[PDB]
Scaffold this active site. Structure first.
Site, PDB file in Angstrom:
ATOM      1  N   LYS A   1       0.804  -1.228   0.000  1.00  0.00           N
ATOM      2  CA  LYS A   1       0.000   0.000   0.000  1.00  0.00           C
ATOM      3  C   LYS A   1       0.841   1.286   0.000  1.00  0.00           C
ATOM      4  CE  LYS A   1      -1.072  -0.502   4.997  1.00  0.00           C
ATOM      5  NZ  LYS A   1      -0.588  -1.940   4.977  1.00  0.00           N
TER       6      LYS A   1
ATOM      7  N   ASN B   1      -1.527   7.151   6.295  1.00  0.00           N
ATOM      8  CA  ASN B   1      -0.793   6.188   7.083  1.00  0.00           C
ATOM      9  C   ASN B   1       0.714   6.176   6.765  1.00  0.00           C
ATOM     10  OD1 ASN B   1      -0.937   4.027   9.102  1.00  0.00           O
ATOM     11  ND2 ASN B   1      -0.393   2.671   7.406  1.00  0.00           N
TER      12      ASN B   1
ATOM     13  N   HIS C   1      -2.048  -8.226  11.988  1.00  0.00           N
ATOM     14  CA  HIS C   1      -2.743  -7.529  13.080  1.00  0.00           C
ATOM     15  C   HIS C   1      -3.690  -8.369  13.899  1.00  0.00           C
ATOM     16  CE1 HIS C   1      -1.013  -4.001  11.418  1.00  0.00           C
ATOM     17  NE2 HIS C   1      -1.730  -4.064  10.307  1.00  0.00           N
TER      18      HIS C   1
END
Ligand SMILES: O=C(O)CC[C@@H](NS(=O)(=O)c1ccc(COc2ccc(/C=C3\SC(=O)NC3=O)cc2)cc1)C(=O)O
EC number: 6.3.2.9
Length: 435
Positions: A115, A138, A183
């Site tokens: 990303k 981010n 995560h």
């Protein structure tokens, strides 16, 4: 939205939290700030007249709020936060605040891997076209620091966490590049709950871009797709060379790209599909593909000397990312692979496939070092820190070898972030890698 008079609480400092503080102050609203860490970064750069509470959450403050702004680094499942939600107290994040104010189209990018590269790339495409573009989210600057009346396009990297607290995003073009386990310490409902968070990015998006090779990137009018052998954007292999193709038309021979590897080429396709949906001219987008050098800490050759390549892939903070580095990897002699840190409860077994043969050594460190070593104990050493692992492997390195820090874990147990971890590897590589 109008925040005047509201009682506002920000959870989390760092850069992001500070940008949220400044956001509210510049709008004439003094928020209060809390952070579960005793001395959160940026504490000292907090302005004196902002009330703060560190070391834990303050439920008095939360249950008093009209609006809670939660940093991505706190779980919405946190008991204090779900108590507030139960009370009907509104909870958002920085991205949500951004989307309410932004006055240019937003290209939104998420995914377990790739990303930051896609986001940067789409930014460089805009720049090549003479477009005033704000790139961040981010990565780079927090989104709220991008906000500028003259911006003509925004390109935002978004994590799963940011998306969980965002509801007003209407992306001009949005993508999930892939979904691989990550995560899991934040998603007790497992892979589908993680996926569910990233799927939010597609709601109200004008174009969705999906990975034809990863069904998990598809929603539950159709999406534009990219892929290797299939998809509206795909690759065509002719005779040792490779092309980017859009619906059967050749658009770029990848020998013009400075990036290499199938997965970088599918990143280019994703970026191009996003740039196209955003209305960027094709010619300058292709041109950006040929000038882009890559990001620091992303399979980055920090030293090639004496027949040995030292590669900083410190941005590999999950299994899918390390697998991306290992899959098809060419090594002349021995691969000396550095694994370790905080594995976030991930299954490491998918890496095992790549660690057979006589030409691999593992140097496993940090919190989950023992679990990483257990992938193949016979060819594994375990230390406490990455510096110890480097000083263990360096004497063993021979002309033709590769040293690869591609740790498959977060650095946060022993480092500030994956950048500090890459920087430290780079310095050690240079010390240990010449005479
Ligand atoms: O750098 C690495 O090695 C790992 C990065 C890694 N990224 S990531 O967890 O997705 C992540 C999300 C947001 C940020 C920046 O913003 C934060 C602000 C506060 C906190 C911690 C807080 S807030 C609080 O009230 N109590 C806390 O302990 C964490 C992050 C940094 C990392 C990961 O992918 O594993």
């Amino acid at each position: 939205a109008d925040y005047q008079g509201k009682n506002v609480v920000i959870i989390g400092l760092g850069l992001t939290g500070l940008s949220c503080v400044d956001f509210f102050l510049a709008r004439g609203v003094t928020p209060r700030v809390m952070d579960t860490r005793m001395t959160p970064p940026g504490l000292d750069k907090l302005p004196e007249a902002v009330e703060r509470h560190t070391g834990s959450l303050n439920d008095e403050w939360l249950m008093a709020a009209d609006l809670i702004v939660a940093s991505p680094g706190i779980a919405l499942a946190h008991p204090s936060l779900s108590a507030a939600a139960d009370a009907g107290i509104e909870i958002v994040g920085d991205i949500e605040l951004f989307c309410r104010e932004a006055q240019a189209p937003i290209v939104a990018i998420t995914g377990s891997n790739g990303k930051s590269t896609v986001t940067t790339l789409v930014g460089e495409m805009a720049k090549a076209a003479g477009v005033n573009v704000g790139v961040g989210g981010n990565i780079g600057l927090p989104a709220l620091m991008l906000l500028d009346d003259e911006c003509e396009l925004y390109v935002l990297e978004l994590s799963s966490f940011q998306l969980e607290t965002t509801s007003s995003l209407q992306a001009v073009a949005a993508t999930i590049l892939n979904v691989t386990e990550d995560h899991m310490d934040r998603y007790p409902f497992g892979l589908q709950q993680y996926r569910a968070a990233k799927l939010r990015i597609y709601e109200n998006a004008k174009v969705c871009v999906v990975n034809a090779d990863d069904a998990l990137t598809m929603p539950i009018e159709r999406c534009v797709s990219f892929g290797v052998n299939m998809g509206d954007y795909h690759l065509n292999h002719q005779q040792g060379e490779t092309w980017l193709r859009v619906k059967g038309e050749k658009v770029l021979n990848v020998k013009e790209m400075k990036l290499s590897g199938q997965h970088n080429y599918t990143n280019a396709l994703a970026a191009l599909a996003l740039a196209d949906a955003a209305g960027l001219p094709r010619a300058s987008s292709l041109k950006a593909l040929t000038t882009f050098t890559g990001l620091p800490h992303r399979f980055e050759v920090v030293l090639e000397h004496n027949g040995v390549r030292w590669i900083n892939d410190s941005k590999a903070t999950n299994v899918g990312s390390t697998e991306a580095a290992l899959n098809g990897l060419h090594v002349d002699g021995t691969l000396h692979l550095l694994l370790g840190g905080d594995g976030k409860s991930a299954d490491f077994s998918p890496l095992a496939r790549y660690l057979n043969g006589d030409n691999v050594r593992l140097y496993c460190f940090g919190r989950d070092g023992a679990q990483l070593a257990a992938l193949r104990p016979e060819v594994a050493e375990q230390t406490e820190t990455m510096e110890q692992a480097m000083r263990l492997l360096a004497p063993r390195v021979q002309p033709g070898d590769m040293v690869l820090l591609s740790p498959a874990c977060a650095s946060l147990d022993q480092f500030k972030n994956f950048e500090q971890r890459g920087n430290e590897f780079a310095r050690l590589a240079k010390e240990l890698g010449s005479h």
